[PDB]
């Protein structure tokens, strides 16, 4: 439905996602580890019973009413991981995630507090500014006519060149700034 690489979820992907959501909401219903492990192997056997169903329509039907069974038997407040979206510590440190370009606007009396760091930042920005036009001309020699098809980015194929559109992935802030 909504994915970065492809446009859809396959049938096998929806089976695996229902399996994972069913185990997580089961663990939310079944707090203790051993009781969860008992009912989790029971649910795993319930999945593996119709593992070899060759009819795609019958497999889609069993997946659909399995989603119905799951929607009835879900936990109201499922355990969300804390840094996962919906958790308690999700996007908590984003107020400390200052982007990298703010170092360039420092006064020189506080750029002199870290001479080796900015003496290295200059050669990082040098590497970026001599990689930019080569990776742009890499992008326009590989993109098909009518635009790109998927959102998947191509790698660097040559030696000496860097992968295209790499600066805000390599120089992103840390999870604990």
């Amino acid at each position: 439905a909504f994915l970065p690489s492809a446009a859809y979820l396959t049938h096998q992907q929806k089976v695996l996602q229902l399996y994972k959501r069913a185990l997580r909401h089961l663990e939310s219903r079944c707090v203790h580890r051993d009781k969860y492990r008992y009912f989790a192997c029971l649910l795993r056997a319930r999945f593996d019973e119709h593992k070899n169903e060759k009819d795609m329509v019958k497999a889609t039907q069993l997946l659909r009413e399995a989603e119905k069974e799951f929607w009835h038997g879900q936990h109201p407040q499922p355990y969300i991981f804390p840094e996962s979206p919906g958790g308690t510590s999700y996007e908590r440190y984003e107020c400390y995630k200052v982007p990298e370009w703010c170092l360039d606007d420092w006064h020189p009396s506080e750029k002199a507090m870290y001479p080796d760091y900015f003496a290295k930042r200059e050669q990082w920005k040098k590497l970026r500014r001599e990689s930019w036009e080569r990776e742009v001309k890499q992008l326009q020699e590989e993109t098909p006519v009518g635009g790109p098809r998927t959102e998947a980015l191509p790698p660097a194929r040559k030696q000496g060149d860097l992968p295209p559109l790499w600066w805000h992935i390599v120089t992103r802030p840390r999870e604990r700034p």
Partner: protein
């Protein structure tokens, strides 16, 4: 199925540059290069000087003004002695004792 060869190559090269960046976010030993720059002083400066200031204030600018510090009059019992007069307040009537 897992990744494609192109995705594995791009993630490996982004990973190598990302680890180079993270390793180059550390400090040198000389960094930060810093520029060239009374035992119970707390209980003196934060208490005993503000007690002086507030006591001078309340004593010669607040209580010299009418009805600023109004105090509830102290509780008089049978048996007390008024320090302004000396009249002993007489004790209560004898109790119809219960036990």
């Amino acid at each position: 199925s897992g990744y494609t060869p192109d995705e594995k190559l791009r993630l490996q090269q982004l990973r190598e540059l990302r680890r180079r960046w993270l390793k180059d976010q550390e400090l040198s030993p000389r960094e930060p290069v810093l520029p060239p720059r009374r035992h119970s002083i707390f209980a003196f400066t934060h208490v005993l000087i503000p007690v002086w200031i507030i006591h001078y204030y309340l004593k010669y600018h607040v209580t010299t003004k009418p009805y600023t510090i109004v105090e509830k009059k102290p509780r008089i019992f049978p048996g007390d002695t008024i320090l302004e007069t000396g009249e002993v307040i007489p004790p209560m009537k004898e109790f119809p004792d219960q036990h």
